[PDB]
Amino acid sequence: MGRDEAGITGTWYNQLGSTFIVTAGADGALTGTYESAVGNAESRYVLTGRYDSAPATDGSGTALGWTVAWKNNYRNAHSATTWSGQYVGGAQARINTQWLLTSGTTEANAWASTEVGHDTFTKVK
Amino acid sequence: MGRDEAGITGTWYNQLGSTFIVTAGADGALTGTYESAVGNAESRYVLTGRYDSAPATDGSGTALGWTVAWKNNYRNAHSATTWSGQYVGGAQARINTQWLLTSGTTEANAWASTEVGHDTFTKVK
Amino acid sequence: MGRDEAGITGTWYNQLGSTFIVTAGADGALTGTYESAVGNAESRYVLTGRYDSAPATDGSGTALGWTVAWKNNYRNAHSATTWSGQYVGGAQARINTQWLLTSGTTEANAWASTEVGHDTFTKVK
Amino acid sequence: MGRDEAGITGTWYNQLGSTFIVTAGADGALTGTYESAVGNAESRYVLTGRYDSAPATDGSGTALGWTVAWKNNYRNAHSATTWSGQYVGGAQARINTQWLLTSGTTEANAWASTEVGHDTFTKVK
Ligand SMILES: O=C(CCCC[C@@H]1SC[C@@H]2NC(=O)N[C@@H]21)NCCCCCN(Cc1ccccn1)Cc1ccccn1
Ligand SMILES: O=C(CCCC[C@@H]1SC[C@@H]2NC(=O)N[C@@H]21)NCCCCCN(Cc1ccccn1)Cc1ccccn1
Ligand SMILES: O=C(CCCC[C@@H]1SC[C@@H]2NC(=O)N[C@@H]21)NCCCCCN(Cc1ccccn1)Cc1ccccn1
Ligand SMILES: O=C(CCCC[C@@H]1SC[C@@H]2NC(=O)N[C@@H]21)NCCCCCN(Cc1ccccn1)Cc1ccccn1
Ligand SMILES: [Fe+3]
Ligand SMILES: [Fe+3]
Ligand SMILES: [Fe+3]
Ligand SMILES: [Fe+3]
Ligand SMILES: [Fe+3]
Fold it and tell me: In this UniProt entry, which cysteines form S-S bonds (chains A, B, C, D)?
């Protein structure tokens, strides 16, 4: 199995109250759904990503990332967010991320297409 | 089909000489391989991502993102990059992105875990 | 007198244990020193920046930013960090930032020149 | 004098048509004005920043950064941009930057407070 396949798989919550449900595959795949508590979003959206399935054994975290395009059967916000971060295991497991949210824009507005932020996910709350 | 399924699917090159080979699915999926011309990387890596399969019809671009974890059969750089951006169609089609590259780190180096940059992909190298 | 001139001026600490000493001028200037608890840094470095001296009155925060170039009489890390963020007043006043740390690099390494992160500053600890 | 004091001082233009007028001081100071061709901006705004006044001699660029708060006598966009980057000298001198644009927001919208982008400045056009 991947080293943190079991630790990453499951339900995660971030500081905004969003819910990140993910399955880690033994080869590096991430698949799941994301539900945002904020923004132009309702219900669940497909996500897909990748993770390092053989991380360093020196106490380092486990690099990973995933993408949501904000289109589902309810809404289309013409945008996509990618989260890039690392998983840290243990009693208070965390996924610490930074993210890039790009909107489809006209060429005149493309300088302002992308927001950046940071989300921390925990297995509780 | 996704509105830009045909325009996104194929081989792309960025300004560093990296090669991004992608298939866009009608529902929003992106799958393919990435080969970086720079960094701790050799040969192809799996990528997965998502795109807006029903973008605005007002001349706006098409939001999308994808992830590579930098582990393959040759190397493991204990890191993952996510690209977030928009596809702009037409005779000089482009995918304009910004990206976040996170390494697995110890908690002491985690403040320095993530680089940020920008890549532009075209259909011609 | 800037609206938050009095609230911003003083000593601030972030989650890494770094110390940010700043004076806010009535026109929008920020001047002070920064001492980082981490990285290739020792003792204090000059900082300068700007803040919105007439913020919105609707409960919004106060936008601001500043720069440190990591050269002083002790060390030169050939890099500079800019923090961009907002000040939020009140009993638990905070400056919430994201930052970009760029190193001087060769053109071959320039794709990897810049790290991104987030710091939260408070008046205590 | 700073090593690139003479090369940095002067008028610069980015890809959007904005105009950056700056004086570099021998100790590391940057002072000047910024005029944006885009966004909620009119005429010139104060800027201040810092640069590495003793960069590496191995052909590396020169790290620097600066801030604009988007308030002047004409408009107040309740926001600030910081540019972080490096100066590269020579016949086609360039300042290559990434930037963070933070607006003052309510706490409910703070997740969306910050845009990120990249500007390249040249001495011509
Ligand atoms: O909303 C969506 C889809 C849902 C995304 C959820 C994000 S994903 C990272 C995170 N993690 C989570 O769990 N949830 C959030 N797309 C469109 C975004 C357009 C950006 C528009 N505005 C923000 C804004 C919000 C409210 C009122 C006004 N303006 C950008 C902006 C930036 C700076 C200054 C001003 N405005
Ligand atoms: O290399 C990889 C896997 C490949 C990624 C390729 C990227 S993906 C975005 C892009 N698009 C492309 O096509 N290719 C590139 N991971 C490890 C990254 C560790 C970062 C270490 N150093 C950079 C460095 C380079 C050379 C010598 C020394 N240090 C970070 C850093 C930040 C600032 C200052 C100094 N160092
Ligand atoms: O250190 C300085 C001056 C001090 C800055 C302090 C920052 S300012 C934002 C913050 N807030 C604070 O208060 N303090 C910190 N410049 C040089 C930066 C070189 C980056 C090299 N490496 C990081 C690293 C650390 C340890 C061992 C190896 N490599 C980049 C990198 C990126 C990703 C993956 C790997 N490496
Ligand atoms: O404008 C200013 C002051 C001037 C700044 C100039 C920047 S400084 C980096 C650069 N370099 C330059 O030279 N010029 C630009 N502040 C307020 C920003 C509010 C953001 C609102 N919007 C963008 C937007 C524009 C038009 C219509 C709609 N939305 C954010 C957004 C983001 C993502 C998706 C959707 N909306
Ligand atoms: Fe907007
Ligand atoms: Fe490093
Ligand atoms: Fe490095
Ligand atoms: Fe907005
Ligand atoms: Fe908006």
Answer: none
User: D117 CB near a chain A CB, below 8 Å?
Assistant: yes
Q: Which amino acid is at C23?
A: T
Q: Which residues of D does the annotation place in the binding site for biotin? A: 34, 45, 83, 99, 111
Residues of D in contact with C69 (CB under 8 A): 28, 50-53, 63-65
How far CA B66 is from CA of A14, A72, B23, in Å, comes to 21, 18, 12
Closest CA of chain A from D28, distance in Å: 29
Chain A residues in contact with B107 by the CB 8 A cut-off are 59, 61, 88
Resolution (A): 1.5
> Domain map of chain D by residue range?
5-122
Nearest CA to D45 among D13, D17, D77?
D77
Q: What's the maximum distance between 2 C-alpha atoms anywhere in chain A?
A: 48
In the reported structure, the alpha carbon of residue B112 is separated from the centroid of ligand 7 by a whole-number distance in angstroms of 10
Q: For residue D79, which atom of ligand 1 is closest to its CA?
A: 34
What value does the CA radius of gyration of chain B take, rounded to a whole number of Å? 15
Method used experimentally: X-ray
* C44 backbone dihedrals φ, ψ, rounded to 5°: -95, 150
**Which DSSP symbol is given to B8?**
H
**What CATH number is given for B5-122 in this structure?**
2.40.128.30
A52: which residues sit within 8 A by CB, 6+ positions away?
Answer: A28, A62, A63, A64, B69, B70, B71, B76, B78, B79, B80, B104
